[PDB]
Amino acid sequence: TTPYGVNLTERALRYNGTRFGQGETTATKANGATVQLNDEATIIKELADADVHGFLAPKTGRRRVSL
RNA sequence: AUUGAAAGUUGUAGUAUGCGGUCCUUGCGGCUGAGAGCACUUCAGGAGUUGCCCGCG
């Protein structure tokens, strides 16, 4: 509902949320925007579900537990 | 931020459809609350009494 809802993963719209893995290192937003996963700052800036529920990036670590 | 971190044991599904507690059946026939019976027997409205008293068509 909020206008800031663009910053969400495509998985979230489908009620997914496995949140990537070894074979995945690029995040696709709702509009299909490429997001890199080197650092947690950009991950939580460009994605909202990963900010609050955490995520997992085994290639580069950056583990974030859910709040 | 604990060998923990990400995670629906998930989504769709009628015990459902038709099936008479049914058809016949007298609470039926006979039956005296009847026969006997004095509101009878005794009885005065009774005993006293001046329409009373005066009189010129």
Return the half-sphere exposure (C-beta side, CA atoms, 13 A cut-off) of residue A10.
11
Nearest CA among A23, A47, A22 for reference residue A34 = A47
Nearest CA among A51, A47, A56 for reference residue A67 = A51
Decide if A23 contacts A30 (C-beta within 8 A).
no
Experimental technique, in short, is: cryo-EM
Q: Is the CB of A15 under 7 A from strand B?
A: yes
CA distance A37 to A62: 8
* DSSP label of A45: H
Q: Is the CB of A21 under 7 A from strand B?
A: yes
